[PDB]
Amino acid sequence: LDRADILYNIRQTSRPDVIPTQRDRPVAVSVSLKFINILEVNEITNEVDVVFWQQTTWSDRTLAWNSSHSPDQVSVPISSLWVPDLAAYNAISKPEVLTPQLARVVSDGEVLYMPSIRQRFSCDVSGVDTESGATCRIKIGSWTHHSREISVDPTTDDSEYFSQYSRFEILDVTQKKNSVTYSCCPEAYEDVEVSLNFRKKG
Amino acid sequence: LDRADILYNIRQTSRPDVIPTQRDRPVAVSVSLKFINILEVNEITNEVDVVFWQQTTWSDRTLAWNSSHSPDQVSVPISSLWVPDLAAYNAISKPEVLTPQLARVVSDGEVLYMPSIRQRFSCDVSGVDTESGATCRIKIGSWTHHSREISVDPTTENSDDSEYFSQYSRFEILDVTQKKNSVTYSCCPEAYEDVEVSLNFRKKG
Amino acid sequence: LDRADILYNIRQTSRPDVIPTQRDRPVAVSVSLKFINILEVNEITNEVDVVFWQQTTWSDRTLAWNSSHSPDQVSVPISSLWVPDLAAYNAISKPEVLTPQLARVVSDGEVLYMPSIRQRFSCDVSGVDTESGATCRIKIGSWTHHSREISVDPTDDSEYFSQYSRFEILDVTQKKNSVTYSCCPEAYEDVEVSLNFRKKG
Amino acid sequence: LDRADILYNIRQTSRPDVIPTQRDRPVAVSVSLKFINILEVNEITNEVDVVFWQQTTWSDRTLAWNSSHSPDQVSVPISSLWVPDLAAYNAISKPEVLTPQLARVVSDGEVLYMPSIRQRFSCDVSGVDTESGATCRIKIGSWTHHSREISVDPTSEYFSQYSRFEILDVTQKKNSVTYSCCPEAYEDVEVSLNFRKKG
Amino acid sequence: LDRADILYNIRQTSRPDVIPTQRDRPVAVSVSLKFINILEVNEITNEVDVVFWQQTTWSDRTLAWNSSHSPDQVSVPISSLWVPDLAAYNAISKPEVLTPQLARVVSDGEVLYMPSIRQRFSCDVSGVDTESGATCRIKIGSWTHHSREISVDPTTENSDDSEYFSQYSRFEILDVTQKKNSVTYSCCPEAYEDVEVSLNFRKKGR
Ligand SMILES: c1ccc(-c2cncc(N3CCCNCC3)c2)cc1
Ligand SMILES: c1ccc(-c2cncc(N3CCCNCC3)c2)cc1
Ligand SMILES: c1ccc(-c2cncc(N3CCCNCC3)c2)cc1
Ligand SMILES: c1ccc(-c2cncc(N3CCCNCC3)c2)cc1
Ligand SMILES: c1ccc(-c2cncc(N3CCCNCC3)c2)cc1
Ligand SMILES: c1ccc(-c2cncc(N3CCCNCC3)c2)cc1
Ligand SMILES: c1ccc(-c2cncc(N3CCCNCC3)c2)cc1
């Protein structure tokens, strides 16, 4: 198989609408935010404008191929792949995807989608101008798939990719996993809560 | 049937353009707004900028499948489904859908669609910076289907509903009420149903 | 015929690019604007931001069906229909369509399309703060079809106007016009909508 | 042939991606701007926001039909036609097309496309508040087709009386430019808009 | 072959999703930016709004045709072609493409794509209103393809810095330099190439 054959096969047979659950197990989705920039902060409105790497990982075995004498990875448009229906619960603008919308697919069926995203959020901006800084929390989870269909899990220097030219600096980033039941649905929905501790530079 | 078969079948036979009236009855559409945020308010122009979840429910039997030994629910892109043509009459921007545009479909044909939407409305902002607050009314109904084709009703509430509102808003919600109306417009002979959602809110002090 | 059959037929024989003229007569298009709101007015720049329902009506016999024992109306996506190529000549933004883009089609072939639209126009804003108000004129006609192909005609002044606007409507009138531009031999029809409005006391 | 047949034929055979050269002669494209409005002018940044009709004309013989007993013109979506790949070199926003994107096609293959466009340009705004006014130049040509493939040539009265500005004069010049990156000449039309603020 | 045949063939067989690697070797992609305008600069936020021609060049042999008695070049919509998945790492808006999205394809398979782009970047704006000027650095590379799949060539030949630069900008260009970098990201284990373009500019002030 060359890349042309692999991509032809994926295009003809991937079902982008079909969640790739195996044996009534959930699809395990890894989520991790790498902050690139903090562009605007409003301590009165409690709004922030940030740019982050949304590093997203999952397995889809229907994509797998024998790579014994073949490329073991290809890049694939996400329009030809199933992708998890993740959303930030406290976002107040839609995600502005800054980068080409291609995922990397490994021959064992591992998919890695890592777009750079600019988005506005409602969160706690108090303390942004102090030693301890502000802590803005961002919840991301599957919009329509409960915990028996999609599980989300944090994977893991916090400023590695953070712009040195921002007016802000990152003090710390922590992630944590949540299982929430909402009074109107019987099942639990998982999210990752990302806490960004940052402050205005001096 | 596995999920792949169910979604294949739906994709091949949905008929997204066809309102699923059963016999000669209206499609019963449930609608309810859960407010997530109030972002901007202007008392001189009587405009508000708001984020809400638009909880929407209806039945489409053409989607039903035998779930005896199968998944009883799947997620489906709304582009593959008939969806009610709802609109807010006093909206002054088009809905900005913040979330993935997927509905949940149950094996008995029940459809649940709930996008998170940011939108601007024209409404009564007077009193917002007082203790009794302002009362903004949002009117939602089918744009082109009269009452014999689509009926709209509020869903019954959850104890949780008041708690999706952001604690970080400059504003706080005092109360949310809903009400069903049937209006006849001068341009058209039949009645059109809407739900009016009254949002009583004020600036935090 | 049920609705599924009607909509299948419309979709399958869908000729959205083909103007439905009958017998070498023009397609008669009705248009009227129902003003919903006036959001922003600038008397220095002579610009207004408005919300209106664009009530549009025409006949397309290729859509017709025998409704003797069938629904006599269906809702149809305008993407599956021919639609007159109307434009406001003094618009300075593209139309922002606020509603689902569905038209109502009657079994005799009549089509009724009435979207809510937000749009900005260049027009006379002088006198908006006076008692007689300003009069803003909105010119609407077919962009590319002359009078032998499309004719345009008019279809309560504030039955739908928002009570929460900073403005009030004093009067709305419509005149028809037929214009031969220096660019083309044929005449093009338009409707002129005059909106007389003022800032509330 | 009725309109339905003509439009069916065009939709099936028009090759929107294929430049309609005949006998290795350039496609002759006429372009002219009719100014409708000047909305915003910035003396700080040297930017102007203007609305114009972009009157564009060319011949595509593959569209032609026998019109002896048929309509001699139809309106056609530009998505079904080859369109010259014109761009304004000093534009700083993409063209906002205000009107239905339909062209008029004549039975001999002549195409006439004239959208109303709102667009923002970088140009000389100095003098906008004097009697002599400012002169803003807009340069338009084919982005990727040189002079042996596309030639461009020139083809007040529609200007809004409600603009804060008035037009003193519009002139049009044609140029043939060779750029560093490329061996062939590219043609453009330069439109000079002499305008001023009304007092 | 006439143009119609060449374009038909390209439309029928180009695999837009398939990177045109020969063997195990990378597709060499050339990238250079020609600055057209600097529209807005914010020294407090360290943000700039710029317009440039993003001259992009690569080879795709699957597009090649015998041009002995045929046109040796055609213009082709990029939607019918594989194009490299380049992104500016410090962009804070998506690219606003100002021009028709057509690439020029030569009969040997060389592709030349040169759109005019307006985009906002986060970078060092300090010194913009001084004589020595600011230096804003723009980083562009393949988003998902490592160095064995795409190499980015920043090299230049006979370029001048202000040739296409607008005389009506509030800013002037002092110098433009290009440089290649190779980085290993903590996400993955391979090297990824980028071009770093350094724009030395200042506010006009004489
Ligand atoms: C059963 C009933 C409703 C939904 C459903 C559809 N569409 C959005 C949601 N959401 C609420 C659950 C938690 N995630 C936020 C969105 C749920 C799914 C399964
Ligand atoms: C017959 C029945 C309805 C319509 C129709 C189409 N398109 C918008 C409307 N509207 C008035 C009804 C209430 N909803 C607001 C808009 C009506 C046309 C013909
Ligand atoms: C405080 C009080 C109410 C709400 C609130 C927001 N958003 C929807 C509701 N609901 C309950 C009332 C019944 N109708 C709609 C659902 C309540 C938030 C904070
Ligand atoms: C929008 C607003 C709130 C939440 C939200 C997230 N995470 C936990 C909660 N809550 C915990 C108890 C369950 N009911 C609602 C309150 C709410 C999500 C989206
Ligand atoms: C022959 C007849 C009409 C047109 C034509 C194309 N495209 C815009 C127009 N317009 C002038 C007519 C009335 N509407 C304004 C724009 C005309 C072209 C060739
Ligand atoms: C060979 C010849 C021309 C181009 C080409 C592609 N794409 C934009 C240009 N431009 C410069 C020429 C004049 N038009 C401005 C843009 C040239 C590529 C390869
Ligand atoms: C294997 C190889 C590459 C990726 C991959 C996917 N998606 C974005 C990246 N990035 C890091 C490489 C340099 N460009 C920034 C984005 C890498 C995933 C698995």
3-state secondary structure E113-136: ECCEEEEEEECCCCCCCCCCCEEE
Among all ligands shown, which has an atom nearest to the Cα of E74? Answer: 6
> If we measure between CA atoms, which residue out of D65, D67, D34, D39 comes closest to residue D52?
D34
Contact E88, E152 (CB under 8 A): no
* Residue located via tokens 């009304």: D198
> If we measure between CA atoms, which residue out of C95, C186, C97, C198 comes closest to residue C140?
C95
Residue E144 CA to ligand 7 center (angstroms) comes to: 4
Which tokens belong to C143? 């962009």
Q: What is the DSSP string of B31-47?
A: EEEEEEEEEEEETTTTE
CA distance linking residue C120 with residue C94, whole number of Å: 8
Closest-lying ligand 6 atom to the alpha carbon of residue D141: 14
Kind plus residue range of the DSSP H or E element containing B13: helix B3-13
Q: Is C57 on the interface with B (CB under 8 A)?
A: no
- Cα C94 to the chain's mean position, in Å? 14
Which of helix, strand or coil describes residue E143? coil
Q: Is E124 on the interface with A (CB under 8 A)?
A: yes
Residue B61 is classified by DSSP as G
Residue B151 has phi, psi (to 5 degrees) of -110, 145
User: Based on C-alpha coordinates, what's the Rg of chain D?
Assistant: 19
Q: What is the DSSP string of C80-142?
A: GS----EEETTBSS--EE-S--EEEEETTSEEEE--EEEEEEE---TTTTSSS-EEEEEEEEE
Contact D75, C144 (CB under 8 A): yes
Residue A112 is classified by DSSP as E
> If we measure between CA atoms, which residue out of D56, D111, D117 comes closest to residue D81?
D111
Please calculate the CA angle D118-D124-D129 and round it to the nearest 5 degrees: 90
Kind plus residue range of the DSSP H or E element containing E6: helix E3-13
Distances (CA, A) of B38 to A113, B34, B48, B121, B204: 32, 12, 8, 11, 12
CA distance linking residue B182 with residue B180, whole number of Å: 7
Q: Is B15 on the interface with C (CB under 8 A)?
A: yes
Which tokens belong to A159? 């400023």
Q: Give E69's contacts in chain D (Cβ within 8 Å).
A: none
Q: CB distance E122–A3 less than 8 Å?
A: no
Ligand 7 proximity of E144 Cβ (cutoff 6 Å): yes
Q: Is D99 on the interface with C (CB under 8 A)?
A: yes
CA distance linking residue B50 with residue D28, whole number of Å: 52
Q: Show Cβ contacts of residue E70 under 8 Å, excluding neighbours closer than 6 positions.
A: E1, E2, E6, E107
* Residue located via tokens 């079909």: A18
Q: Show Cβ contacts of residue B117 under 8 Å, excluding neighbours closer than 6 positions.
A: B51, B52, B53, B54, B95, B96, B97, B98
Q: Is B22 on the interface with C (CB under 8 A)?
A: no
Distances (CA, A) of E39 to A28, C174, D140, E125: 46, 44, 20, 13
* Residue located via tokens 């996993």: A177
Name the region of D46 (left: φ>0; alpha: ψ -120 to 50; beta: rest): left
User: Could you count the other beta carbons within 10 Å of the beta carbon of residue A157?
Assistant: 8
Kind plus residue range of the DSSP H or E element containing C74: strand C73-77
Q: Give B118's contacts in chain A (Cβ within 8 Å).
A: 92-93
CA distance linking residue C82 with residue D158, whole number of Å: 29
* Residue located via tokens 């309509």: D71
Instruction: Give residue C89's identity as a one-letter amino acid code.
Output: Y
Name the region of E34 (left: φ>0; alpha: ψ -120 to 50; beta: rest): beta
Which tokens belong to C76? 């149809």
Strand order in the sheet with D86-88: D86-88, D134-142, D185-197, D165-178
CA distance linking residue C46 with residue C42, whole number of Å: 6
Please calculate the CA angle B149-B153-B158 and round it to the nearest 5 degrees: 150
Which tokens belong to C169? 């409507």
Which tokens belong to E108? 């040997």
Closest-lying ligand 5 atom to the alpha carbon of residue C142: 14
CA distance linking residue E115 with residue E54, whole number of Å: 6
B-C CB pairs within 8 A amount to 69
Q: Give E143's contacts in chain A (Cβ within 8 Å).
A: 99-100, 102
What are the DSSP E strand ranges found in B72-149? 73-77, 86-88, 96-97, 102-106, 110-113, 116-122, 134-142
CA distance linking residue E142 with residue E149, whole number of Å: 9
CA distance linking residue E177 with residue E155, whole number of Å: 10
Ligand 3 proximity of B35 Cβ (cutoff 6 Å): yes
Contact B44, C166 (CB under 8 A): yes
Distances (CA, A) of A19 to A26, A146, B107: 9, 12, 17
Kind plus residue range of the DSSP H or E element containing A10: helix A3-13
Residue A69 is classified by DSSP as T
Which tokens belong to A132? 């301890």
3-state helix, strand, coil in chain C (%, to 5): 10, 45, 45
CA distance linking residue B3 with residue A186, whole number of Å: 20
Closest-lying ligand 2 atom to the alpha carbon of residue B183: 13
Q: CB distance D145–E75 less than 8 Å?
A: yes
Distances (CA, A) of B129 to B119, B133, B135, B198: 21, 6, 12, 17
Do the strands B171-184 and C47-59 form a parallel or antiparallel pair, or are they unpaired?
unpaired
Ligand 1 proximity of A85 Cβ (cutoff 6 Å): no
Tell me the residue length of chain A. Answer: 202
Name the region of C19 (left: φ>0; alpha: ψ -120 to 50; beta: rest): beta
How many alpha carbons fall within 13 Å on the CB side of residue E61? 6
Which of helix, strand or coil describes residue B204? coil
Which of helix, strand or coil describes residue A8? helix
- Domains of chain D from N-terminus onward: 1-199 (2.70.170.10)
CA distance linking residue E26 with residue E36, whole number of Å: 31
Residue A116 is classified by DSSP as E
Which tokens belong to B55? 């909880």
Burial of D153 (0-12, 13-18, 19+ CB in 10 A): middle
> If we measure between CA atoms, which residue out of A173, A60, A112 comes closest to residue E189?
A112
Ligand 7 proximity of A114 Cβ (cutoff 6 Å): yes
Do the strands D116-122 and C150-153 form a parallel or antiparallel pair, or are they unpaired?
unpaired
Of D87, D123, D144, nearest to E98 by CB-CB distance is: D87
Kind plus residue range of the DSSP H or E element containing B3: helix B3-13
Choose which residue among B164, B176, B177 to substitute to test ligand 3 binding: the one with the highest number of ligand atoms within 8 A of its C-beta: B176
> If we measure between CA atoms, which residue out of C155, C51, A95, C34 comes closest to residue B88?
C51
Q: How was this one solved?
A: X-ray
CA distance linking residue E120 with residue E103, whole number of Å: 24
Sign (positive or negative) of CA dihedral A153, A158, A164, A167: positive
How many alpha carbons fall within 13 Å on the CB side of residue E177? 8
Q: Minimal Cα–Cα distance from A184 to chain E, Å?
A: 38
Which of helix, strand or coil describes residue E148? coil
Q: CB distance A123–B161 less than 8 Å?
A: no
Q: Is B86 on the interface with C (CB under 8 A)?
A: yes
Choose which residue among A81, A101, A112 to substitute to test ligand 7 binding: the one with the highest number of ligand atoms within 8 A of its C-beta: A112
Q: Show Cβ contacts of residue D151 under 8 Å, excluding neighbours closer than 6 positions.
A: D26, D27, D28, D29, D187
Residue E91 is classified by DSSP as B
Residue E10 has phi, psi (to 5 degrees) of -65, -50
CA distance linking residue B138 with residue B129, whole number of Å: 20
Distances (CA, A) of B174 to A94, B119, B203: 28, 20, 10
Ligand 3 proximity of B32 Cβ (cutoff 6 Å): yes
Residue C77 has phi, psi (to 5 degrees) of -60, 130
Mutation target vs E (from D21, D43, D144; most E CBs, 10 A cutoff): D144
Among all ligands shown, which has an atom nearest to the Cα of C88? Answer: 5
Kind plus residue range of the DSSP H or E element containing C5: helix C3-12
Residue A72 has phi, psi (to 5 degrees) of -95, 0
CA distance linking residue E109 with residue E65, whole number of Å: 8
CA distance linking residue B104 with residue B67, whole number of Å: 15
Distances (CA, A) of E165 to B198, C33, E33: 56, 47, 11
Burial of C194 (0-12, 13-18, 19+ CB in 10 A): middle
Please calculate the CA angle E168-E173-E174 and round it to the nearest 5 degrees: 145
User: Could you count the other beta carbons within 10 Å of the beta carbon of residue D156?
Assistant: 9
* Residue located via tokens 């007993």: D69
Contact D90, D19 (CB under 8 A): no
Ligand 5 proximity of D106 Cβ (cutoff 6 Å): no
> If we measure between CA atoms, which residue out of D133, D126, D140 comes closest to residue D46?
D126
Which of helix, strand or coil describes residue C12? helix
Ligand 1 proximity of A182 Cβ (cutoff 6 Å): yes
Residue C78 has phi, psi (to 5 degrees) of -65, -15
Dihedral in degrees, nearest 10, Cα atoms A54, A59, A62, A66: 110
Contact B125, B42 (CB under 8 A): yes
Residue A44 CA to ligand 4 center (angstroms) comes to: 23
- The residue numbers preceding gaps of C to N over 2.5 A in chain C are 155
Please calculate the CA angle B80-B81-B85 and round it to the nearest 5 degrees: 125
CA distance linking residue B30 with residue B157, whole number of Å: 12
Mutation target vs E (from D143, D180, D184; most E CBs, 10 A cutoff): D143
For chain B, report the end-to-end CA distance as a whole number of angstroms. Answer: 57
**Secondary structure of chain D in HEC code, one letter for each residue:** CCHHHHHHHHHHHCCCCCCCCECCECEEEEEEEEEEEEEEEECCCCEEEEEEEEEEEEECHHHCCCCCCCCCEEEEEHHHCCCCCEEECCECCCCEECCCCEEEEECCCEEEECCEEEEEEECCCCCCCCCCCEEEEEEEEECCCCCCCEEEECCCCCCCCCCCEEEEEEEEEEEEEECCCCCCEEEEEEEEEEEEECC
Contact A196, A138 (CB under 8 A): yes
Distances (CA, A) of D184 to C21, E2, E71, E104: 48, 20, 15, 13
Q: CB distance A114–E46 less than 8 Å?
A: no
Residue B91 is classified by DSSP as B
Q: Show Cβ contacts of residue C201 under 8 Å, excluding neighbours closer than 6 positions.
A: none
Which of helix, strand or coil describes residue E24? coil
Which tokens belong to C132? 């007689």
Q: Which chains touch E (3 or more CB pairs under 8 A)?
A: A, D
Choose which residue among C112, C116, C159 to substitute to test ligand 2 binding: the one with the highest number of ligand atoms within 8 A of its C-beta: C112
Residue B164 has phi, psi (to 5 degrees) of -85, -10
Q: CB distance A85–B102 less than 8 Å?
A: yes
Contact A91, A99 (CB under 8 A): no
Sign (positive or negative) of CA dihedral E37, E43, E44, E47: positive
Burial of D172 (0-12, 13-18, 19+ CB in 10 A): middle
Distances (CA, A) of B19 to A61, B58, D78: 37, 11, 33
Residue A188 CA to ligand 1 center (angstroms) comes to: 10
